[PDB]
Amino acid sequence: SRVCQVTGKRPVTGNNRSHALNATKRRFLPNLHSHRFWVESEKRFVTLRVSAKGMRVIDKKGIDTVLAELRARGEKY
Amino acid sequence: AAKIRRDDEVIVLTGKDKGKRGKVKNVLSSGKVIVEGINLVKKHQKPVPALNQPGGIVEKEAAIQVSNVAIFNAATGKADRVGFRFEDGKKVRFFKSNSETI
Amino acid sequence: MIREERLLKVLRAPHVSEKASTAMEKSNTIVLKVAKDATKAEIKAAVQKLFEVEVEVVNTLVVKGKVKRHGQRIGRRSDWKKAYVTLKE
Amino acid sequence: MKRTFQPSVLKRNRSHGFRARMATKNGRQVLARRRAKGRARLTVSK
Amino acid sequence: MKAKELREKSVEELNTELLNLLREQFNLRMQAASGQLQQSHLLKQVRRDVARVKTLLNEKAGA
RNA sequence: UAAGGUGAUAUGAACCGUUAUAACCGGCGAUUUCCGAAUGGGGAAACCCAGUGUGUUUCGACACACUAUCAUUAACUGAAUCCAUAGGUUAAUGAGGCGAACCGGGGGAACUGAAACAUCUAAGUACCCCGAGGAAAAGAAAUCAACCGAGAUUCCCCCAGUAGCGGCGAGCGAACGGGGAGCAGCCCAGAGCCUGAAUCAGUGUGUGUGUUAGUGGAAGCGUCUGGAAAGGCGCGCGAUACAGGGUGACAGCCCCGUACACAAAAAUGCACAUGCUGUGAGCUCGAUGAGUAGGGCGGGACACGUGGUAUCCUGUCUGAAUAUGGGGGGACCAUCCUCCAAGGCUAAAUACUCCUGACUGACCGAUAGUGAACCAGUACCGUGAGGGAAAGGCGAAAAGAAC
RNA sequence: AGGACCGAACCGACUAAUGUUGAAAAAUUAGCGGAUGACUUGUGGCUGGGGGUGAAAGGCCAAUCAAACCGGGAGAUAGCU
RNA sequence: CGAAGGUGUGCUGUGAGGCAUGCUGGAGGUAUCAGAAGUGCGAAUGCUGACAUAAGUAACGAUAAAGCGGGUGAAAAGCCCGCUCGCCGGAAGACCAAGGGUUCCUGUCCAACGUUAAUCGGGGCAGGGUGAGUCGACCCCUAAGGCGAGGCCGAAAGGCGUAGUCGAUGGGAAACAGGUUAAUAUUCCUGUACUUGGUGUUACUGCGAAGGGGGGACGGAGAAGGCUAUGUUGGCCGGGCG
RNA sequence: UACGGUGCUGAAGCAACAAAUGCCCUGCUUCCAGGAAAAGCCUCUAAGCAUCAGGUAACAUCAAAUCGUACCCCAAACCG
């Protein structure tokens, strides 16, 4: 669905409050983006569906670490 | 665990025929016995053709309860309560109020 | 084998009726009430095993027992199969 | 005058049958309510 | 028959006596549906004997 | 246990046993058609058609086994593309649906009150969905307190309709602290001493205690009434039993029971001891959880509606220090106080009854009580989801009216 | 040849009468319009509740339609009888 | 040697009420003083049941039409039989699908059902009856459309969809005539046939598919030809002469 | 003769004419609005097979299972 595959950002719900504080139910959607990554360990290009915060996690720790944690969650990469 | 059994000789205690005595023909599942010569009921038998055809007013022996009858002690001259003692390995009946096994 | 047990199990009753007696005197065909599944070949094998006779063909039919009423209780009767077996002369 | 129930067993068993209920989630919910209340004829499967 | 009397028996004889019981069963239900058999009760006990034999067919052979 | 049985309306005919494999009861087995998660494909549920291999063929066919889909592992393979993956096959292991209520999470109303109504209330309630257990959640301080100190969580009585929140309206409503119930602490982020060391899951053996069949079980007679005595009159007896049910009217002494004393071949619940399989025990030392805390924007939760509003959670955009350090003490600042987040495990006290047994009732007695005391979710109505009744009593016994 | 003509089947429903606790919760009788098409019909599908469908009346959606039916919030609320 | 309940009668209190008692009934009721209440009905277009009124009133369901004799029986306008009359005849006839499910036939019955009677019936009760290589289903193939491994998408539920797999209302091979029972007949019997598979035997030889190609394979209107179903007349045969 | 009917015996069994909406016609002619799909059937080879296996014809034998069949079907039996 609309799930960050690295970080797990489920689309949450919320109240939309206008200037007169009239509540209307709305949905918060993450900044999901499909990305093609390069791993020199597999030496190829993988396809993930991540968010920008997830992209910064890919920047900070190694992609070989995030891939093994994704395999620890038993997910698909 | 039944106190009165089939070929006993009993007396009734509550009934129009109180004090009279007879042999037991049958013990039914309801908790009723059939005693010979004691309960007499006039059945108006409607005869069916494809069988023996009496017609008439016939006589049968109806039922009275197990609680009403009592085992005649046949030595004392009146009734007695009966219990279950353990004589040699079969559990047996015995007359109460004197040490007598039936 | 249970095949022998099957052919011993199939045949239930010989059938007695007016159309039964008419077909029996006319074309030497007996009428039998059989089991529920009781196919053609199993019926023919069972009569040729058990009555020790000759058989040409067998005509099968399934008949529905009538929906009777007893007091207020409706009861649909059993559902049995009848087979006309045409013996040889 | 042409009444509203002009019956046929094919549309009847295709719409309200057993398997058309069992293939659907809310159909299985309907059958579970019908069993919990305890009706004799469950659906029109006949 | 009585249970130990079938416990001592052997399996091929168990099968032949099964088939003899079934043939006996067939003759009885044919005579019963014809109008014979004053004694109907025979039929019932015959069925029970078949059951007893088949019970040993699942125990004298193997569970 | 057993001298009586073949379930009931519902009698019969035919037989079984009576001193013991007639019946009834209890543990464990065997069989368990077809549909049904339905599992070989399909489908209008209770049906249609298969295939692979075995071994029986009287040569026309038989009977049994397996064959779904996914997750995980393993092994043969294995493309564009050399490699190597994707993919494919086979096997093994697990999952699947049903169920009354409780619990946790994901979503989430409006009628209604405000004597209109939009903020608010109703209410995170109804309902939908997911998941698990006999309970579940939480849970071992980056906690409260006040310069005094306590020690995880949960639940009940107070505090308290109190401080507060609020078109400051309707309403919502704490905590600190006190008294109880119950008590429990841990391990990884790591190395050398250690390898059956203080435990716990799973096996057997041993004892006891319960459960699933059961056994013994006290003590009385006469007379009048009456259809019948259990009533009245008279005279006795039992009671670790006078709870109760029946018997031809109300029975402690007529029957079944009750108090009481027992009883297991077999199978299992519970704790206890005794052994296997895994597991480390405990020291000396180093470490102590990063796109994280905090922030800017927009929401949500704490009693707290953005308010002067701390705290937690976050969708988005950022971004530390890392014990010479960091949080919290209800804007905020300095000093004091106490604790060490960004990793987890954990019994009991707690809410529940689809169901099993006993026992109780200033609860009902056929228009009441469950809708249903009776063959009731039935008859009937509706395409359907769904709706849904009416209906007890002869007598002590059918002796149910021969003729 | 014809969204041609007259006219049965078939599809409708313009007029009058009888019906109104009917024979019938929409009819019958005597007339009437179309009748080779923008027709009619048998079978089997599909679209659904603030939605479907509509040669458009707010018409039809199981005799119910300016928002179906069934269960549930719910014993809504009622300054009214 | 007679409780509650039912039904009268007589005394009694200011009132709700009470007390005594005849008869029916046939086994329960309960003083006094306290206690708890599902505690008191004439109305709610109240609810359920029973019964009234209109009332022995309207009506008896098409204006196709009945009449007589004989039968059966306790009873005949309605049933069976006969003879006339009358109605439909592009149906009010003969078969089917769909839809019902025993309503079909025989014996027996008339309490309920039949807008009356009923000996009758689609009613009660018992018994009997549905025979398939060729008709139809199932089976092969597909349309609209449904489901749909992977897949894509979606807070969950799930949505769509590829391979496939289902889906006749369509495409695929096969049988006719006559006879017969009360109830079945293109199914049973008589006569004459045809299809599609299997195995083996004989003779000639390349077969092999899921791939290719043809074929299946298709609109409306019009008009004419050839024919037949079928009908009329004449002949032929049988009977008649009223 | 149950009195309904069973069983027996059976002559002719041609011609002309009329003729359809039925068959040739899943034709012919014309018109624009341009008029289903796959299989059984016929044929062609691919991998593979190659004494064979198959295939063709002939002959013999066997099989064709299972389910529905009664009755109404413009109605007293279907929906009202």
Curated annotation (Swiss-Prot), chain D:
GO cellular component: cytoplasm; cytosolic large ribosomal subunit
Pfam families recorded: Ribosomal_L34 (PF00468)
GO function terms (MF aspect): structural constituent of ribosome
InterPro entries in the record: Ribosomal_bL34 (IPR000271), Ribosomal_bL34_CS (IPR020939)
Gene3D superfamilies per UniProt: 1.10.287.3980
Keywords associated with the record: Ribonucleoprotein, Ribosomal protein
Domain of life: Bacteria
Transmembrane segments: none
BP-aspect Gene Ontology terms: cytoplasmic translation
Amino-acid biosynthesis in keyword set: no
UniProt-listed PANTHER family: LARGE RIBOSOMAL SUBUNIT PROTEIN BL34M, MITOCHONDRIAL RIBOSOMAL PROTEIN 34 FAMILY MEMBER
Family membership noted in the UniProt record: Belongs to the bacterial ribosomal protein bL34 family.
Subunit structure and binding partners: Part of the 50S ribosomal subunit.
UniProt-recorded name of the protein: Large ribosomal subunit protein bL34
Provenance organism: Escherichia coli (strain K12)
Gene that specifies this protein: rpmH
UniProtKB/Swiss-Prot annotation, chain E:
Gene Ontology MF annotations: rRNA binding; structural constituent of ribosome
Cited PROSITE patterns: RIBOSOMAL_L29
Gene Ontology terms describing biological process: cytoplasmic translation; ribosomal large subunit assembly
UniProt KW keywords: Ribonucleoprotein, Ribosomal protein, RNA-binding, rRNA-binding
GO cellular component: cytoplasm; cytosolic large ribosomal subunit
Phenotype upon loss of function: Cells missing both S17 and L29 grow very slowly and have a rather unstable temperature-sensitive phenotype.
Subunit structure: Part of the 50s ribosomal subunit. Contacts protein L23, trigger factor and protein nascent chains. Might also contact SecE and probably does contact SecG when the SecYEG translocation complex is docked with the ribosome.
PANTHER family from the UniProt entry: 60S RIBOSOMAL PROTEIN L35/50S RIBOSOMAL PROTEIN L29 (PTHR10916), LARGE RIBOSOMAL SUBUNIT PROTEIN UL29C (PTHR10916:SF0)
Similarity-based family: Belongs to the universal ribosomal protein uL29 family.
Protein's job: Binds 23S rRNA. It is not essential for growth. One of the proteins that surrounds the polypeptide exit tunnel on the outside of the subunit. Contacts trigger factor.
Descriptive protein name: Large ribosomal subunit protein uL29
Gene: rpmC
